[PDB]
Design an enzyme around this catalytic site. Structure first.
Site, mmCIF file in Angstrom:
data_model
loop_
_atom_site.group_PDB
_atom_site.id
_atom_site.type_symbol
_atom_site.label_atom_id
_atom_site.label_comp_id
_atom_site.label_asym_id
_atom_site.label_seq_id
_atom_site.Cartn_x
_atom_site.Cartn_y
_atom_site.Cartn_z
ATOM 1 N N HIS A 84 0.871 -1.188 0.000
ATOM 2 C CA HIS A 84 0.000 0.000 0.000
ATOM 3 C C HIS A 84 0.898 1.226 0.000
ATOM 4 C CE1 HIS A 84 0.079 -0.611 4.482
ATOM 5 N NE2 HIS A 84 -0.139 0.694 4.567
ATOM 6 N N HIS A 86 1.589 3.769 2.179
ATOM 7 C CA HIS A 86 2.187 4.443 3.330
ATOM 8 C C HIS A 86 3.703 4.238 3.369
ATOM 9 C CE1 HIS A 86 -1.856 4.246 5.731
ATOM 10 N NE2 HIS A 86 -1.816 5.306 4.947
ATOM 11 N N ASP A 88 5.788 3.033 5.469
ATOM 12 C CA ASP A 88 6.321 1.732 5.856
ATOM 13 C C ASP A 88 6.269 0.679 4.732
ATOM 14 O OD1 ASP A 88 3.429 1.805 6.345
ATOM 15 O OD2 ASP A 88 3.631 0.101 7.728
ATOM 16 N N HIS A 149 -7.238 -1.767 6.106
ATOM 17 C CA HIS A 149 -6.335 -0.751 6.629
ATOM 18 C C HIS A 149 -6.219 0.476 5.713
ATOM 19 C CE1 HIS A 149 -2.681 0.986 8.290
ATOM 20 N NE2 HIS A 149 -2.245 1.000 7.044
ATOM 21 N N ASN A 180 -2.796 2.329 13.115
ATOM 22 C CA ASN A 180 -2.994 3.636 12.497
ATOM 23 C C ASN A 180 -4.098 3.548 11.444
ATOM 24 O OD1 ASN A 180 -2.805 6.109 11.170
ATOM 25 N ND2 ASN A 180 -0.725 6.418 11.932
HETATM 26 C C1 LIG Z 1 3.777 4.457 8.160
HETATM 27 C C2 LIG Z 1 2.432 4.757 8.784
HETATM 28 O O1 LIG Z 1 1.227 4.370 8.177
HETATM 29 C C3 LIG Z 1 0.149 5.176 8.615
HETATM 30 C C4 LIG Z 1 -0.082 6.463 7.741
HETATM 31 C C5 LIG Z 1 -1.268 7.283 7.733
HETATM 32 N N1 LIG Z 1 -1.044 8.235 6.823
HETATM 33 N N2 LIG Z 1 0.155 8.057 6.307
HETATM 34 N N3 LIG Z 1 0.755 7.016 6.856
HETATM 35 C C6 LIG Z 1 2.400 4.386 10.352
HETATM 36 C C7 LIG Z 1 3.046 5.240 11.221
HETATM 37 C C8 LIG Z 1 3.060 5.003 12.601
HETATM 38 C C9 LIG Z 1 2.389 3.894 13.127
HETATM 39 C C10 LIG Z 1 1.702 3.027 12.267
HETATM 40 C C11 LIG Z 1 0.926 1.863 12.456
HETATM 41 C C12 LIG Z 1 0.602 1.102 13.759
HETATM 42 C C13 LIG Z 1 0.616 -0.291 13.727
HETATM 43 C C14 LIG Z 1 0.338 -1.001 14.878
HETATM 44 C C15 LIG Z 1 0.071 -0.344 16.072
HETATM 45 C C16 LIG Z 1 -0.203 -1.108 17.363
HETATM 46 S S1 LIG Z 1 -1.959 -1.584 17.496
HETATM 47 C C17 LIG Z 1 -2.284 -2.670 16.097
HETATM 48 O O2 LIG Z 1 -2.264 -2.399 18.709
HETATM 49 O O3 LIG Z 1 -2.871 -0.441 17.454
HETATM 50 C C18 LIG Z 1 0.080 1.031 16.073
HETATM 51 F F1 LIG Z 1 -0.131 1.685 17.251
HETATM 52 C C19 LIG Z 1 0.340 1.781 14.931
HETATM 53 C C20 LIG Z 1 0.538 1.471 11.184
HETATM 54 C C21 LIG Z 1 -0.365 0.304 10.837
HETATM 55 O O4 LIG Z 1 -1.265 0.030 11.677
HETATM 56 O O5 LIG Z 1 -0.344 -0.227 9.688
HETATM 57 N N4 LIG Z 1 1.015 2.321 10.288
HETATM 58 C C22 LIG Z 1 1.715 3.281 10.902
HETATM 59 ZN ZN LIG Z 2 -0.417 1.725 6.393
HETATM 60 ZN ZN LIG Z 3 1.442 -0.376 8.516
#
Ligand SMILES: C[C@@H](OCc1cnn[nH]1)c1cccc2c(-c3ccc(CS(C)(=O)=O)c(F)c3)c(C(=O)O)[nH]c12
Ligand SMILES: [Zn+2]
Ligand SMILES: [Zn+2]
Length: 231
Positions: A84, A86, A88, A149, A180
Site C-alpha cells: 500500500h 504508506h 512503511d 487498513h 494507524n
Molecule cells: C507508516 C504509517 O502508516 C500510517 C499512515 C497514515 N497516513 N500516512 N501514513 C504508520 C506510522 C506510525 C504507526 C503506524 C501503524 C501502527 C501499527 C500497529 C500499532 C499497534 S496496534 C495494532 O495495537 O494499534 C500502532 F499503534 C500503529 C501502522 C499500521 O497500523 O499499519 N502504520 C503506521
Molecule cells: Zn499503512
Molecule cells: Zn502499517
C-alpha cells in the site's frame, strides 16, 4: 532465534527471520510522530534472484535492508512490490530504484503515494482493481481483498510454503486496537478479512504488517479488534 522486536532493533538496523524454505521476513524500526514502531516485510526466493515485498520504512532502513540481504542470503533483489501507499511500504523505493531493483505497486497505490508525497513505485500492477482479484508475480500470488487498513492494501501468498503475508490489513495477536487507522475503512475491513480467510484456508503462517507472525487466528483477531475500534 526469537522473532525480533524493537528492543533488539535500533532504528536504522534491519533483521531477517527465516519463515520457511526460501521465505524470510524483514524487520526494521522507525520513529513517527514521536513514537517508535517495528514493521515487517517479506523476501521470497525466485530461483537465483529475490522478490522483495515492502520497503523497510525509510531510505536508510532500506539501504540497511539491502546490506543485510547481501550478508545473510547473497542473492540479488531484482523486483519489489509495495502493498500500500504508506511510508512503511514505499519509503525506500527511491533507494531500491537506484540499486537496480524494479519497483511495482497497483495503480491505486501509485496514485495515493503521488497524492500524499510519498515515494512512487515505477511499474503498475494491473488485474487487482476489484475485491477478490488475484495475479501471479514470480513465486507469489498477489490478492486484493477489498478496503481494510487502506483502500489499496494488497495481500501476498507464497504457495510453495503456505505463507500468508497480510500486510497492514492483518494485526498481530497481542494488538489491542487497529493501529494507524487514518486511511482505513473500518466498516469494510471485516468483510475484506473474511475474503482473505475464504481464499487462503490452508495458510500455515500468517504475517502481519507490524508485529509477530502466527497462524490463521490472526485473521479473526484482526476482525475482532477492528470491530471493537469501530464500536
Ligand atoms: C507508516 C504509517 O502508516 C500510517 C499512515 C497514515 N497516513 N500516512 N501514513 C504508520 C506510522 C506510525 C504507526 C503506524 C501503524 C501502527 C501499527 C500497529 C500499532 C499497534 S496496534 C495494532 O495495537 O494499534 C500502532 F499503534 C500503529 C501502522 C499500521 O497500523 O499499519 N502504520 C503506521
Ligand atoms: Zn499503512
Ligand atoms: Zn502499517
Amino acid at each position: 532465534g526469537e522473532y525480533p522486536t524493537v528492543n533488539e532493533i535500533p532504528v536504522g538496523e534491519v533483521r531477517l527471520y527465516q519463515i520457511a524454505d526460501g521465505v524470510w521476513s524483514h524487520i526494521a524500526t522507525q520513529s513517527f510522530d514521536g513514537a517508535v514502531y517495528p514493521s515487517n516485510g517479506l523476501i521470497v526466493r525466485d530461483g537465483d534472484e529475490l522478490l522483495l515485498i515492502d520497503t523497510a520504512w525509510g531510505a536508510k532502513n532500506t539501504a540497511a535492508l539491502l546490506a543485510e540481504i547481501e550478508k545473510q542470503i547473497g542473492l540479488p533483489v531484482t523486483r519489489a512490490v509495495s502493498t500500500h501507499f504508506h511510508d512503511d511500504r514505499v519509503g525506500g523505493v527511491d533507494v531500491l530504484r537506484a540499486a537496480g531493483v524494479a519497483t511495482y505497486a497497483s495503480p491505486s497505490t501509485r496514485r495515493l503515494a503521488e497524492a500524499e508525497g510519498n515515494e512512487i513505485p515505477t511499474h503498475s500492477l494491473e488485474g487487482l482493481s476489484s475485491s477478490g482479484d488475484a495475479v501471479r508475480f514470480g513465486p507469489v500470488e498477489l490478492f486484493y481483498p477489498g478496503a481494510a487498513h487502506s483502500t489499496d492494501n494488497l495481500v501476498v501468498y507464497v504457495p510453495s510454503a503456505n505463507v500468508l503475508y497480510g500486510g497492514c490489513a492483518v494485526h498481530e495477536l497481542s494488538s489491542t486496537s487497529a493501529g494507524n487507522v487514518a486511511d482505513a475503512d473500518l466498516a469494510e475491513w471485516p468483510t475484506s478479512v473474511e475474503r482473505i480467510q475464504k481464499h487462503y484456508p490452508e495458510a500455515e503462517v500468517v504475517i502481519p504488517g507490524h508485529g509477530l507472525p502466527g497462524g490463521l487466528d490472526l485473521l479473526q483477531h484482526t476482525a475482532n479488534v477492528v470491530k471493537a475500534h469501530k464500536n
